[PDB]
Symmetry: D2
Subunit: 121 residues, 4 copies
């Protein structure tokens, strides 16, 4: 929550600005350094608002649909991962990027990858 809330950057140079709400909500904006994308996009997600206290990360995920008021890529990414708190906080993720496709092309609709986010100030 204060931990998650803030500005984060990944290894590609993308920017993630997020607010973690007391109810488990994540809201913010995402700017991707790569792909069919420009400017900021809405993100929404959820996190474990009462995580384990036993040295485990805090599970979370969020989605961006790659449509904003400037571009539409007809695609959406979800990130699933965990926040690791502390003075060098990290969010470690795997992601799935699905493009809208025709039925015949659905087998090649989804890319998979991994992003590591570092918190800035």
């Amino acid at each position: 929550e204060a931990g998650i809330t803030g500005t984060w950057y990944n290894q590609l140079g993308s920017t993630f600005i997020v607010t973690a709400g007391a109810d488990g909500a994540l809201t913010g904006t995402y700017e991707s350094a790569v792909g069919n994308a420009e400017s900021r996009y809405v993100l929404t997600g959820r996190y474990d608002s009462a995580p384990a206290t036993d040295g485990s990360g805090t599970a979370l995920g969020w989605t961006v649909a790659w449509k904003n008021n400037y571009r539409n890529a007809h695609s959406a990414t979800t990130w699933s991962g965990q926040y690791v708190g502390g003075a060098e906080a990290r969010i470690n993720t795997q992601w799935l990027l699905t493009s809208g496709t025709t039925e015949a092309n659905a087998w090649k609709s989804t890319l998979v990858g991994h992003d590591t986010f570092t918190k800035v100030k």
Copy 2:
């Protein structure tokens, strides 16, 4: 349309509203796993899909905490809606559990769910 009550091959129930500008908001009830009753979900979808026959890209997240249980985990589904006589949402998902750093290699399950509006 996307709005409605959906069921996957496990018998889970996905109740969702698609807002006009791209929001997905609803609840998820899983038939399996460390889960009971409904959980909050939020996500996004392409609110102006292509007009060539392509599906509508979407995704959503559930954190597996509600008033009954907390599994200290979260699932994201990424996929596309395919309209038509038997509308479908085809997805792949990632379920990440909170882990220690040394166990992070085994933190994330992957799978695939297909949803229709047909009730079991």
Copy 3:
């Protein structure tokens, strides 16, 4: 058993021999993608599965180069064999294309294939 000729939901043909000590060896012919004719495959399976009803874990790889084409890519399938009257192999797969470093983020497709011995 695992040995035989299998077909997935795309109509691809997977011909495989399961060696007694865990080898998988065969050929794969994809119905889709940058592919024509048969490609070599190799993999491994659990040659002494559990005796509790569980499936048999397995995986295999195809590099998409043969005498006809080279897509500069490789797919791995990871999954389990489920015996019975209608034997099945349920898999998830990763298709990695060779890319530059800057494009590595978009190098890998993920999907899921289910195989049976029923010919289209």
Copy 4:
């Protein structure tokens, strides 16, 4: 081929010993630092034996079934990725680890992750 052939170690401390054959074969052994595993396991896979020369990686993949003459985990991992050659050669991968399960448990059969291998000498 000479490039791929050798000993490699990942971020977990696992050991990958591989030979790349002229026909596109990969053969060798894998020792995992983690999980239900001990000693070396057979691996087999394939690689693009005539890759692009345009600054792209060489696509490859391999499988380990986690049975050897000392332990059986009833599971198998596949790694899919690319070799990036040069004086600091790397193999960058994503992987899928499937466990044998009952039908009711099949939804939780498969773990996903990513490993980066560094070549040693």
